[PDB]
């Protein structure tokens, strides 16, 4: 009576049914791929691509489909926001339906392989017992793997035949799926260099093909074969688990730290961007330029794109979220409606006061207004018995340039303090928290969720490698 945690060990020595069980897993994965996509498409709003991006709508699979090219939809809408003139068979819905049909086909294939498990192919010719030439099996699979890798990078990514990959400006203000050209240089190893993807996939692909030929031709060393139990299926399983958990960590870091493969306008902005004021510096930069040109403060702030300002918001920060705060980013803060405009806080003396932005590590941060020198000149005191920086005594007035409150000045202590609290959270945008009944708490972006899930899987798979690997090394002792 196999224990519950040893029931799937029945096919360990049944190559015919091993394919079947693997076919099942592949079918389930394919089905979820199309199923989740169909669900997301059914719950996605493409009306506003600026203040309501996919990552704000909590979409997870949609970003990946868009990353490789899928942009139009049979709904007559493009992820760009324009009408899908001809979405074609490869519409978001089409690709989803394809995966679902593939799942079904895999299921029927699994049934056949399960029923007809006793195939002479699995049997070894010398003895007749079921035996798999793991050495060659890896070689043939590696050769095929290399082919696809090179083809994807030299065609789909390059664009010669494939549609292309999603590339965006450093500030993700403007980007789409355009054919890229392999860098083939030192810059090719820059994670934010899109060209690297094509160059790397082409290089890695050709090598993989050659490596596959080697494993197919050259046989394993006698000392290596026994030393690495190259005759054990669990041996490849343990080593394969090591590879998947290794990649998971690399993939997660790429998503968290950001890269050309993780567009900020497809997965949302990275936490480090806010920590370094990436978008904020740009906004102020162009503003200063417009002022240098001679435009009024309103003109400069009016020039600022709402999308750029939207990026400059603690809410879009992926780290600003909770483990059980489930739902789309739109829920918890509302659906962005518009930009109130830049808020300028000035004391009675006329000194310009800057509201210290909330550090990501801080769930709640005290409101502080500092001068250009960096000296606190005003704040909202917790104790008002004898304040020395009270917004009232300092007499701070907030004037909004550009946006909805363009040209609007506020001197009411309460009104100024309200905007000051928003200012510390970055650009002040209008949000509709009624349609979704937002709870008023920030949520994590799909970027953060993906990183958390894959890092967790990676850490667990480490135990899997040690477990299956230990069993292979101590097979004699574990034998029973």
């Amino acid at each position: 009576g196999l224990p519950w945690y040893r029931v799937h060990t029945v096919v360990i020595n049944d190559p015919g049914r091993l394919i079947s069980v693997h076919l099942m897993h592949t079918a389930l994965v394919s089905g979820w791929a199309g199923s989740m996509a169909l669900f997301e498409i059914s719950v996605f709003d493409p009306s506003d691509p600026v203040l309501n991006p996919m990552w704000r709508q909590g979409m997870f699979v949609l970003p990946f489909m868009t990353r490789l090219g899928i942009t139009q939809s049979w709904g007559g809408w493009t992820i760009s926001g324009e009408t899908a003139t001809n979405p074609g068979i490869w519409s978001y819905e089409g690709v989803a339906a394809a995966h679902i049909i593939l799942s079904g086909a895999l299921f029927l294939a699994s049934v056949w392989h399960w029923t007809y498990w006793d195939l002479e192919l699995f049997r070894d010719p010398r003895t007749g017992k079921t035996a798999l030439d793991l050495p060659k099996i890896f070689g043939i699979h590696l050769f095929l793997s290399g082919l696809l890798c090179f083809g994807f990078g030299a065609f789909h990514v390059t664009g010669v035949f494939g549609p292309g990959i999603w590339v965006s400006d450093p500030y993700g203000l403007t980007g789409r799926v355009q054919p890229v050209a392999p860098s083939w240089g030192a810059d090719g190893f820059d994670p934010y260099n899109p060209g690297g993807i094509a160059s790397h996939h082409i290089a890695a692909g050709i090598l993989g093909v050659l490596a596959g030929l080697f494993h197919l031709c050259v046989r394993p060393s006698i000392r290596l074969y026994f030393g690495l139990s190259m005759g054990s299926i669990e041996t490849v399983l343990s080593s394969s688990i090591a590879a998947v958990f290794w990649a998971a960590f690399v993939v997660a870091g790429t998503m968290w730290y950001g890269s050309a493969a993780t567009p900020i306008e497809l997965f949302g902005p990275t936490r480090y961007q806010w920590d370094q004021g990436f978008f904020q510096q740009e906004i102020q930069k162009r503003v200063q330029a417009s002022l240098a040109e001679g435009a009024s403060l309103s003109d400069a702030w009016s020039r600022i794109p709402e999308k750029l300002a939207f990026y400059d918001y603690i809410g879009n920060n992926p780290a600003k979220g909770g483990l059980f705060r489930t739902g789309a980013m739109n829920s918890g803060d509302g659906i962005a409606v518009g930009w109130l405009g830049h808020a300028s806080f000035k004391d009675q003396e006329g000194r310009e006061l800057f509201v210290r932005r909330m550090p990501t590590f801080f769930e709640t941060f005290p409101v502080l207004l500092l001068d250009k020198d960096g000296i606190v000149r005003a704040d909202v005191p917790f104790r008002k018995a004898e304040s020395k920086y009270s917004i009232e005594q300092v007499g701070v007035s907030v004037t909004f340039y550009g946006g909805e409150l363009d040209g609007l000045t506020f001197t009411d202590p309460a009104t100024v303090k309200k905007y000051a609290r928003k200012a510390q959270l970055g650009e002040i945008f209008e949000f509709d928290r009624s349609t979704l009944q937002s709870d008023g708490v920030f949520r994590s972006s799909p970027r953060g969720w993906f990183t958390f899930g894959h890092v967790c899987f990676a850490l667990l798979f480490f135990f899997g490698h040690i477990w299956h690997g230990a069993r292979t090394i101590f097979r004699d002792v574990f034998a029973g």
Partner: peptide, 23 residues
């Protein structure tokens, strides 16, 4: 007015502009 840094720093002391060239 205030320099971008004279603005980014008071808003965010850990801003790259303020955290760079400081020597």
């Amino acid at each position: 007015v205030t320099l971008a840094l004279d603005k980014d720093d008071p808003a965010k002391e850990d801003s790259v502009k303020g955290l760079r060239k400081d020597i």
